[PDB]
């Protein structure tokens, strides 16, 4: 459905439109069009997160 991406570092959300996560979580990448900030889904919510904090899972 969506690509998934592995969190490489912890990311602390500081606004409601951010998607915080812990290194190791696997984020559903709804929108990877922006080069700086992707839109993810994790813990049933949507949010922006730094595209360079994750790696695509290829399998």
């Amino acid at each position: 459905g969506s690509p998934w991406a592995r969190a490489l570092y912890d990311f602390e959300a500081l606004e409601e439109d951010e998607l915080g996560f812990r290194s190791g979580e696997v984020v559903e990448v709804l929108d990877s069009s922006n080069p700086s900030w992707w839109t993810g889904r994790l813990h049933n919510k949507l949010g922006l997160f730094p595209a360079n904090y994750v790696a695509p899972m290829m399998r």
Partner: peptide, 9 residues
């Protein structure tokens, strides 16, 4: 690493 929020959509 390094975070700059000004480029958020």
């Amino acid at each position: 690493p390094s975070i700059d929020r000004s480029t958020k959509p």
